[PDB]
Ligand binder design. Structure first.
Ligand SMILES: CC(C)CCC[C@@H](C)[C@H]1CC[C@H]2[C@@H]3CC=C4C[C@@H](O)CC[C@]4(C)[C@H]3CC[C@]12C
Ligand SMILES: CC(C)CCC[C@@H](C)[C@H]1CC[C@H]2[C@@H]3CC=C4C[C@@H](O)CC[C@]4(C)[C@H]3CC[C@]12C
Ligand code: NA
Ligand code: NA
Lengths: 461, 462
């Protein structure tokens, strides 16, 4: 009774017994550690309120920030993210993302079973640019209407096979771009901090090592999903193609051709030069007296992730706060026999610990907690840091079990079908295929790309 | 004909004849100067798109950023602004700001002419916390309904009440560093460039400017009432006082009592985050039940927070440092060497009158962004305290009281029926001269013993 308020009686709870430790300087900093890590996993607070808590609690105990090295008022990853969001804002303001999801399904829709590959290929291409949650929330109304008019010409299992294709291929196409999922932005913001001399990570080199990785997972999970389970009038009611979709489509082909083919030759120059045209090209008249452009600043501010910059800096103030106190030395002495395992065994034992924790917690929470653990470990045992951080930001996205992990597969669970055991039987095939393909990747073709066997010059010592 | 598109045929225009200069390294950097300054004043682009233009154009010519000194992932002014916005988010989500605007008018509403002072005192107190544009857009529906039921018991009392809402929303917009938006561009420019100064917080901006605005508020009521003329049922239809307004009002008195009365946790940004982050936690609604919702959500907080101020400041720094890497700051620095022979007080009068005149035709964040990296190099060169010049120029930026294109407070009240354009010029020139004279009286007598304005400090370089 009265456990409809289980957020407030838990946040107020956790701060009460945890002040057993009030005794020294490392016990007070470990109090901030087990509180912010607790509210990130259970998500009792909205994940950026919690990132402001080390900026409040640590000066109260007497642990002040002391880092004083930065540069560059506008960073290069911040200007790439500006130009990508303003392309992804007008592509769904003007409903261009339903033309493509219908035209791709129509082309390869011979449908013995090529409808399923038609649905996966249409929502994995849309996840490279849009967010995973917003692109699964519009193919799912489309696919439910198509599969109802097909059965209006056995029928139960083809409704929950089509459900899992939308939820799983929105995540597989969520990688292959550093701006596809949100957890590819926390990796890229942690890496341009802490390692600001590294120039090996841009838009056109994340796509080259991960598009061969996801095409194998996409083609092998279609075969797995189709195994264990078994429209011209829908495109006609979108209307004719408008003016504001031809302009958006032309700037989308122009921008993506220069990213892969190309001090002004950086990828953040193409993002701002073609991205800032969306604030300029006229779209509507509003009688006339004054036009309106393709996107406005109030719509751009709605789509931009501002909470990622608070989440990264809140993870840095917690990590540096453990270094000023004696906590990083104290647990560093009890874990000295960890540096006797081989380099490949650290990869397998960590990527299986991240692909298992991401099923019960959100993906930006488990990439924020684990990324300042593996990167000190990689410099200590004299490994290239990208050799450990690349297969852990890729196995974070592999959240394919029970529908509390990522909000893609909680949308498709909100429909009628697809009880919980249908995800565990289907997700364990895509999970094992996903881990084995990335483990195959960092042994053969990723190593000659980023020079993963040679300790670089951006790592300290 | 076809000049309904005068934005796109002007932005595309200005970039065409201005590449006469393509010849050297300072001529290419002055090309970026006269483009970004042109789109800030005319506002052909939304004022943060333009701040990203020196981050695009300057690496193309070969002028790279080279500054490498900062600290402190979260700054102290950023944590004060977080806690203020989440108090100003729930105060208008739950309509607490109409209780106060009606209860203050009701109390001093004897109305021979105390209705006018009742309206100014209710919308100047609400501008210390809310934004100037959003607090003039809700007293103006209220005052038009009250002045219509008073005349139903007459033309010049409709446009006297209009100008009280537009002018006292700006006078109460100062006295807080988070009241207007141009008090945030001053405070963000000053914690950059001068990071050793600890003299500027919430509780010392209010002490030097609340005596400055109370004199301008009390003297412009006398001026406005002169040149123009010599409600329990409106409060009853708000309903009874709810649950979510008593909780917001209690945390508003708690937070403001500790700001003025108070190892390293005794700062003003601690009170802002400790009482501000309770608005994400206290339950407000049930939504059947199975899961409550708090007083404010993160999607509503993200809507009210000014994110474009941090882009506008860093875009002004990349343009200012870009002129220093090239030879432009030395080239115009040699042609302006006889400027450093005027007295210290004459620089104040000649600059505050140049900023209070330009802010009538351009927006206030555009004229504080262009002028703040001009006066602060000038104050270090002629050996003056930099706060002695920057304080009376961030205060005369807000004095936009003439024709209704200056600030969006007095374009809202112009959008109603009354108040033709000459009624603002006759009324605004009285509030303008009173405003400049009170700040000039302030920086001579009581502001100087507060910030030590005659002694060159230790945070300025040399
Ligand atoms: C973000 C928060 C958790 C930082 C605190 C993380 C602790 C767990 C991290 C910080 C420092 C890390 C240690 C850095 C140093 C060493 C010594 C090396 O031979 C083994 C790795 C080991 C032992 C790392 C283990 C993990 C570690 C101790
Ligand atoms: C933001 C942009 C405009 C920066 C370029 C501004 C130019 C106008 C600013 C930058 C440097 C400034 C100069 C700094 C040095 C001097 C020499 C001193 O005896 C007179 C002031 C004077 C001459 C300043 C005048 C204004 C100035 C030249
Ligand atoms: Na995505
Ligand atoms: Na205000």
């Amino acid at each position: 009774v009265y456990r409809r308020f289980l957020f407030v009686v838990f946040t107020v709870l956790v701060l009460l017994p945890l002040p057993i430790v009030l005794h020294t300087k490392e016990a007070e900093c470990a109090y901030t550690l087990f509180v912010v890590a607790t509210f990130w996993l259970t998500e009792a607070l909205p994940l950026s309120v919690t990132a402001l808590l080390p900026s409040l609690m640590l000066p109260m105990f007497g642990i002040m920030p002391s880092k004083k090295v930065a540069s560059a008022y506008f960073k290069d990853f911040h200007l790439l993210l500006i130009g990508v969001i303003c392309l992804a804002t007008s592509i769904e303001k003007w409903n261009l993302h339903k033309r493509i999801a219908l035209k791709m399904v129509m082309m390869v829709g011979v449908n013995p079973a090529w409808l399923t590959l038609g649905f996966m290929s249409s929502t994995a291409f849309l996840s490279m640019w849009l967010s995973n949650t917003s692109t699964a929330a519009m193919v799912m109304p489309i696919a439910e209407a198509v599969v109802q008019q097909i059965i209006n010409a056995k029928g139960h299992v083809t409704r929950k096979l089509t459900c899992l294709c939308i939820a799983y291929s929105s995540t597989i196409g969520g990688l292959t771009t550093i701006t596809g999922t949100s957890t590819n932005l926390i990796f890229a913001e942690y890496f341009n901090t802490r390692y600001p001399d590294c120039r090996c990570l841009n838009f056109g080199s994340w796509f080259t090592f991960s598009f061969p990785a996801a095409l194998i997972i996409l083609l092998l999970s279609w075969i797995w999903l189709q195994w264990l389970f078994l429209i011209k009038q829908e495109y006609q009611k979108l209307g004719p193609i408008r003016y504001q979709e031809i302009v958006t489509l032309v700037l989308f082909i122009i921008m993506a051709l220069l990213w892969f083919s190309r001090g002004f030759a950086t990828d953040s120059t193409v993002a701002l030069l073609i991205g800032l045209l969306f604030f300029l090209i006229p779209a509507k008249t509003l009688t006339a007296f004054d036009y309106s452009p393709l996107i406005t600043w109030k719509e751009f501010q709605s789509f931009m992730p501002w909470d990622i910059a608070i989440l990264v800096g809140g993870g840095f103030a917690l990590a540096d706060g453990c270094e000023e106190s004696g906590l990083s030395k104290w647990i560093g002495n009890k874990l000295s026999p960890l540096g006797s395992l081989p380099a490949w065994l650290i990869i397998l034992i960590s990527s299986l610990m991240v692909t298992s924790l991401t099923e019960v917690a959100s993906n930006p929470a488990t990439i924020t907690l684990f990324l300042p653990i593996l990167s000190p470990l990689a410099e200590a045992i004299h490994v290239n840091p990208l050799y450990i951080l690349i297969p852990s930001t890729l196995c974070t996205s592999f959240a394919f079990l029970l529908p509390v992990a990522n909000p893609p597969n909680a949308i498709v669970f909100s429909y009628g079908h697809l009880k919980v055991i249908d995800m565990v039987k289907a997700g364990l095939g895509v999970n094992i295929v996903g881990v084995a393909v990335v483990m195959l990747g960092i042994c053969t073709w990723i190593v000659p790309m980023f020079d993963l066997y040679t300790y670089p010059s951006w790592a300290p010592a």
